[PDB]
Design a protein around this ligand. Structure first.
Ligand SMILES: Cc1cc2nc3c(=O)[nH]c(=O)nc-3n(C[C@H](O)[C@H](O)[C@H](O)COP(=O)(O)OP(=O)(O)OC[C@H]3O[C@@H](n4cnc5c(N)ncnc54)[C@H](O)[C@@H]3O)c2cc1C
Length: 450
């Protein structure tokens, strides 16, 4: 119940109507600070709380793989909120007009949203504040430590962000109090039915018109996310430290699609892992990625308006890449050639098949995949657009602060340091095909994804 997690977007005349939780990033009912804080305000004013989700016109920028995963979880979400006497309303259109109309139509008293540092979220908020007079609060329900409290500036390395985040852990790492039930807009299936129809022409296929995506790797919903966490801790947490860099072994947690859509709280994952009596070396490696690297991605996007642009790169990286702009590239590939996996690197290729077929590329190959796009592009800016385009289109965890921070790490050296000076790539960290062969059995990875 710590009120540091709450930030006031606008202070207006407090209405006497239902507290509206505008759910965007954290699509879950358990372990949701935004959902709990909305219920707290509802109790204090003796008024019910409601949940509103907006289905924006931007779903056509992505594929069916992301659309189905989000909506199937929401269908489970609606029934979960119903058993807590909480009605969920699902609107279709721009949030700027849809939230404003819903606020006036339903006589909203307090408006609550979850925190997301992405530009598109800031786009909606600007419109919403321009059409309401009721108070507007936001809650960081995605980070263990609130983004504005962990640091008040951009952090240039994990070395600097780790002590600030770990010092605030004894305060913000706590259990979740129960969501007490409330005291006392057509359908979901049809929206998903018409959404798939509008996206079907853009489906990814491989020659024979057979769909490339395989939807049986990660089931959606809050329930499935919990089982994945239980599976990871019981079976793969011990070997996470020593096998996380091997793409031939499914040793990863596989929590990112649930983490991105907010189907499971990262704080819940950290709480359970801390209780687990596993390999302390593997535990330290795991908490680094879900706490340091995950929450520094929000820090990167929150304190850099141009997080997806060349301007956000460190100065040493910008000048190093600028000094190698005119170096002749060994090869140049178009976006269509990158998309289809038609490069001269069978290792880079096979990473694309895993991305296209499963929607989740291995973490280690994600670094190789992004850095080779820089090596084989006309300019670093062109590689930035290609990497963002492919990641957001085909990753189930894409369109996330982790994605923009991860690409910025691979291409622009964000949260990194200078390495040996090479041509084309400059001082950016370089990952070689020969180097990967010495780290894992590349042939097994290639044969898996042909
Ligand atoms: C170029 C690039 C693109 C990426 N695209 C995305 C993205 O769009 N969305 C996304 O959520 N992840 C992205 N990843 C980050 C990371 O690769 C994934 O989080 C991870 O691979 C997801 O699979 P996992 O949960 O089984 O990994 P795990 O080893 O199980 O890690 C668990 C969690 O820690 C976090 N995490 C792990 N590695 C990183 C990292 N390098 N940076 C930040 N957080 C991390 C993730 O939340 C992850 O879910 C990207 C990284 C890079 C370098």
């Amino acid at each position: 119940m710590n009120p540091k997690r709450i930030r006031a977007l606008k202070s207006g005349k407090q209405g006497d109507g239902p507290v509206v939780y505008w759910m965007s990033r954290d699509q879950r009912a358990e372990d949701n600070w935004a959902l709990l804080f909305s219920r707290a305000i509802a109790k204090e004013a003796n008024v019910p709380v409601v949940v509103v989700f907006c289905l924006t016109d931007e779903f056509l920028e992505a594929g069916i793989r992301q659309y189905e995963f989000m909506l199937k979880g929401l269908q489970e979400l609606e029934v979960s909120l119903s058993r807590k006497k909480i009605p969920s309303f699902f609107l279709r259109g721009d949030p700027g007009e849809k939230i404003s109309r819903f606020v006036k139509d339903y006589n909203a008293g307090t408006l609550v949203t979850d925190f997301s540092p992405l530009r598109i979220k800031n786009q909606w908020i600007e419109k919403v504040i321009s059409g309401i007079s009721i108070p507007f609060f936001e809650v960081d329900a995605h980070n263990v430590v609130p983004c504005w409290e962990a640091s008040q500036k951009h952090e240039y390395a994990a070395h600097t962000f780790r002590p600030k985040l770990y010092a605030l852990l004894p305060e913000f790492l706590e259990e979740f109090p129960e969501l007490e039930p409330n005291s006392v807009v057509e359908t979901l299936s049809d929206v998903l039915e018409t959404g798939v129809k509008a996206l079907l022409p853009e489906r990814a296929l491989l020659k024979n018109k057979d769909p490339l995506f395989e939807p049986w790797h990660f089931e959606p919903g809050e329930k499935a996310a919990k089982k994945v966490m239980e599976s990871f801790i019981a079976d793969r947490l011990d070997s996470y430290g020593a096998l996380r860099n091997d793409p031939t072994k499914n040793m990863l947690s596989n929590l990112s699609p649930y983490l991105h859509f907010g189907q499971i709280s990262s704080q819940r994952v950290v709480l359970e892992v801390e209780k687990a009596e596993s390999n302390p070396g593997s535990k330290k490696a795991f908490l680094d990625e879900i706490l340091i690297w995950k929450e520094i991605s929000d820090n990167f996007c929150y304190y850099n308006p141009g997080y997806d642009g060349f301007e956000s790169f460190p100065s040493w990286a910008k000048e190093s890449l600028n000094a190698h702009r005119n170096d002749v590239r060994s090869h140049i590939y178009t976006l269509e050639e990158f998309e289809a996996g038609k490069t001269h690197d069978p290792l880079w290729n096979a990473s694309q098949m895993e991305l296209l077929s499963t929607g989740k590329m291995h973490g280690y190959t994600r670094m190789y995949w992004a850095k080779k796009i820089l090596e084989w592009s006309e300019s670093p800016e062109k590689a930035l657009e290609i990497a963002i385009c492919l990641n957001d289109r085909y990753e189930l965890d894409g369109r996330d602060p982790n994605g923009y921070a991860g690409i910025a790490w691979s291409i622009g050296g964000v949260h990194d340091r200078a390495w040996g000076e090479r041509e084309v790539t400059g001082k950016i960290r370089y990952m070689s095909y020969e180097g990967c062969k010495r780290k894992f059995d590349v042939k097994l990875y290639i044969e898996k994804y042909s």
